[PDB]
Amino acid sequence: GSHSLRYFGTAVSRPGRGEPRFIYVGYVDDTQFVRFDSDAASPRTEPRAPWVEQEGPEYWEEETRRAKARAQTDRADLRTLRGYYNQSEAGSHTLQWMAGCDLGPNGRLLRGYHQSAYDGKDYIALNEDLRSWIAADMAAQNTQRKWEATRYAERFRAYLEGPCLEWLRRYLENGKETLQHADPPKTHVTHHPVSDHEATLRCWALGFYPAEITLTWQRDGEDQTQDIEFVETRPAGDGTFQKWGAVVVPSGEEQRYTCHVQHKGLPEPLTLRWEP
Amino acid sequence: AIQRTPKIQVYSRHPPENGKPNFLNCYVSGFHPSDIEVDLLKNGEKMGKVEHSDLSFSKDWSFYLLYYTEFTPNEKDEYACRVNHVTLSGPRTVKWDRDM
Ligand SMILES: CCCCCCCCCCCCCCCC(=O)OC[C@H](O)CO
Numbered sequence: 001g002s003h004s005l006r007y008f009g010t011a012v013s014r015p016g017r018g019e020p021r022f023i024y025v026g027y028v029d030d031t032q033f034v035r036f037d038s039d040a041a042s043p044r045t046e047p048r049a050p051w052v053e054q055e056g057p058e059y060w061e062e063e064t065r066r067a068k069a070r071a072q073t074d075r076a077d078l079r080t081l082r083g084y085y086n087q088s089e090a091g092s093h094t095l096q097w098m099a100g101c102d103l104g105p106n107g108r109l110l111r112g113y114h115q116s117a118y119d120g121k122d123y124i125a126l127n128e129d130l131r132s133w134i135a136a137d138m139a140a141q142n143t144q145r146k147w148e149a150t151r152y153a154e155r156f157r158a159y160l161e162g163p164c165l166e167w168l169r170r171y172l173e174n175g176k177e178t179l180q181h182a183d184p185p186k187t188h189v190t191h192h193p194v195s196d197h198e199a200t201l202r203c204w205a206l207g208f209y210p211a212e213i214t215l216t217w218q219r220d221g222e223d224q225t226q227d228i229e230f231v232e233t234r235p236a237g238d239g240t241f242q243k244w245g246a247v248v249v250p251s252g253e254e255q256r257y258t259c260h261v262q263h264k265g266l267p268e269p270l271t272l273r274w275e276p
Numbered sequence: 277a278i279q280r281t282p283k284i285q286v287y288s289r290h291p292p293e294n295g296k297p298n299f300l301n302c303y304v305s306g307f308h309p310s311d312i313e314v315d316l317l318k319n320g321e322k323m324g325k326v327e328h329s330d331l332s333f334s335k336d337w338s339f340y341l342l343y344y345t346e347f348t349p350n351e352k353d354e355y356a357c358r359v360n361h362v363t364l365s366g367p368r369t370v371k372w373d374r375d376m
Pocket residue numbers: 007024025026034035036045046063064066067068070099155156157159
């Protein structure tokens with residue numbers, strides 16, 4: 001259990017059709033709180049969570065300046081990468097990066113990240129010791145040797161160890177009423193006959209925050225792996241999440257089946273049954 | 277370069293009830309590259325005033341987006357989400373099912 005500040009970036013080259021598209025987002029835990037979209041007239045870093053709107057005018061101008069500097073760097077990197085892979089000048093490519101810090105309950109840095117991908121594949125990542133790089137291929141090794149030359153890992157680590165945690169603590173305090181509130185899932189079980197002798201039990205978990213959750217079906221206390229479907233956790237749109245798991249059972253043996261639900265918002269793990 | 281086909285979930289923000297205003301969600305995830313066209317269909321017709329989230333992506337670098345609009349279900353109207361992506365030969369359409 002740790003809070004996290006993370007920024008994510010996507011840069012997509014638009015060969016012939018002008019400059020690349022840059023879309024940047026920032027998150028505290030599972031809560032997005034800022035965006036930057038280069039495809040505006042005069043684009044700016046913008047609030048996407050209520051508790052960051054109180055930030056002063058200097059904040060928004062410096063974050064906007066920071067986004068524009070990253071865009072320039074990303075466009076350079078798109079060119080460089082096109083070269084390393086001897087790729088056509090025609091053809092759109094995609095660069096993605098993420099970076100940020102996990103706050104340890106100690107108050108210091110628990111884990112830090114700086115990772116990147118090109119055309120959907122891992123390219124280079126900062127190692128967990130924050131001192132070295134892992135490179136995916138020989139093109140990425142070229143980036144690695146150069147970033148070693150400028151001691152980039154040490155300089156970025158300083159951001160992670162200092163300001164990254166400083167801003168995360170700030171955000172956590174300003175948005176504490178939502179960011180530090182575990183919304184428990186509202187849960188229930190629905191019944192849908194499949195045939196004259198089988199029916200579907202669907203177990204629902206709704207409106208929970210944070211996203212992480214476990215949801216299983218059991219028959220006589222044993223965990224079910226056949227005749228099931230679990231959907232990926234999905235956003236409700238209001239900042240909370242949803243998940244369901246369905247199992248096909250013999251008509252008349254429904255009560256042998258229990259849905260098991262664990263979530264940070266649940267003091268105890270939940271056991272659920274169809275309740276006609 | 278890897279390309280990935282979008283997964284699609286269509287669903288409501290809250291348990292649906294006829295006459296009760298609600299939000300219709302089409303969540304597209306797991307796709308690469310990022311260009312993607314997503315429509316919400318009311319009785320086979322593209323709804324206006326559909327908004328979407330800001331492009332983000334998961335730990336495997338594949339993108340996800342939430343498209344959503346306001347709607348009030350009733351026993352007559354049928355809803356679906358229709359997706360176009362470079363990995364798909366023609367649009368993929370998923371109907372809204374009230375039980376999912
Ligand atoms: C959603 C809008 C985005 C908000 C604004 C745009 C963010 C772009 C910067 C990347 C993330 C933060 C890293 C930047 C930290 C920084 O200053 O980097 C020091 C280096 O370690 C070398 O000094």
